[PDB]
Amino acid sequence: ALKPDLVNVIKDVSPPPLVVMAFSMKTMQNAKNHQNEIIAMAALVHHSFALDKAAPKPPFQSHFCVVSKPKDCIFPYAFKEVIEKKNVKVEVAATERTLLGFFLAKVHKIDPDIIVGHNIYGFELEVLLQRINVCKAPHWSKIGRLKRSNMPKGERNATCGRMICDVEISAKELIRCKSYHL
Amino acid sequence: ALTGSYKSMFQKLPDIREVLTCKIEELGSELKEHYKIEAFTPLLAPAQEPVTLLGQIGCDSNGKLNNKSVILEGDREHSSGAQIPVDLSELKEYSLFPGQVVIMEGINTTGRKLVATKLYEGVPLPFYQPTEEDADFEQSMVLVACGPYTTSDSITYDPLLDLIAVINHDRPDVCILFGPFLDAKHEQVENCLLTSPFE
Structure with missing residues (x-):
């Protein structure tokens, strides 16, 4: 866009059903250098969620997973062989490098625009940046919806162009409890 | 320099907090000025980086301490005023005790825990740098001695006699004699013995 008045207000419809991601994960500690990294994560995927209508059941339209090995005790035998019969849609992986690689590849494959998850800011998102x-x-840069010259350093601007949904905070909009940690 | 007396037999709680605070703040600020460091952290946003914190050290439990129960508490403002446990095992050399305000550096993994990395050093202020027309003086003798003023079974002040003897002997500029000129834990008193008033 060039001139700031070529904006065209128009009021026909609601925007169409939009992709949403059912993302979650599970980190684990490391007494070696006192860090809490992760060797397994996944997400469910819905591919056109109605915004001005009822809820789409099934709760998804696809999903995936990914899993790496630690440096304290390594995998039990035949994980792919044991699971794919039961098939909660998990895929084997080798490195947390490979993990993030095919994670952003899953983005690339779907590229949603709303990231759903709880405990994100206080605990997790910064760890993804780490x-x-x-x-x-x-x-x-595919973690957002853009390419940048570099990844930056109150550090929330790094993620852009991708609706960072909430599950914890927004939960407290309505109902009261002792914990709102779900 | 405390001319008169107080007017106090009772406190008011939140103003204590106020005074603790003002202490912590002013000290921290005056230190940070010299120490050219950027900014500290609200103490409950865990983030695995170098991170510099300000606070004061305290006991978690009733009485004394260890090397594994130091706890930290922050000011009213800089970090919203809360507490976090600590430890320093990884660190090398320190010296702590309650009431003491200090800067520290560690790595906050879980939020409700931390482990130290370093302890920057305290600083003294420059002493009085006086004039150069007044103090151009000569030698000078001052003697001083604390209390109590007897062996704790009599009322004689024999040592006071010996003292005043030395005094009259040596002609000093000024002497100063700390109390306490009559202890209470002095056995001769706390059985309610002395056949006299006190003043």
Whole structure:
């Protein structure tokens, strides 16, 4: 866009059903350098969520997973063999490098616009930034919806163009409890 | 310099907090000025980086301490005023005790826990740098001695006699004699013995 008045107000419809992601994960500690990294995560995927209508059941339209090995006790035998019969849609992986790699690849494959998850800011998102700083996978910027000259350092601006949904905070909009940690 | 007396037998709680605070704040600020560091952290936003904190050290439990129960508390403002446990095992060399305000540096993983990395050093202020027309004086003798003023079974002040003897002997500029000129834990008193008033 060039001139700030080529904006065209128009009031026909609601925007169409939009992709949403059922993202979650599970980190684990490391007494070695006193960090809490992660070796397994996943998400469910819905591919056109109605915004001005009722809820789409099934709760998804696809999903995936990814899992790496630790440095304290390594995998039990035949995980792919044991699971894919039961099939909660998990895929084997090798490195947390590979993990983030095919995570952003799953983005690339779907590219949603609303990231759903709880405990994000106080505990997790910054850890994702830490790990993308460490592993240094190419096309780092796909975590947002843009490419940037670099990944920046109150550090929420790093993620842009991608609705960072809430599950914890927004929960407290309506109902009261002792915990609102779900 | 405390001419008169107080007017106090009772306190008011939140103003204590106020005074603790003002202490912590002013000290921290005057230190940070010299110490050219950027900014500290609200103490409950865990983030695995170098992070510099301000606070004062205290006991978690009733009485004394260890090397594994130091706890920290922050000012009213800089970090919203809350507490966080600590430890320093990884660190190397320190010296702490309650009431003491200090800067520290560690790594906050879980939020409700931390482990130290470093302890920057305190600083003294420059002493009085006086004039150069007044104090151009000569030698000078001052003697001083604290209390109590007897062996704790009599009322004689024999040592006071010996003292005043030395005094009259040596002609000093000024002497100063700390109390306490009559202890209470002095056994001769706390059985309610002395056949006299006190003043």
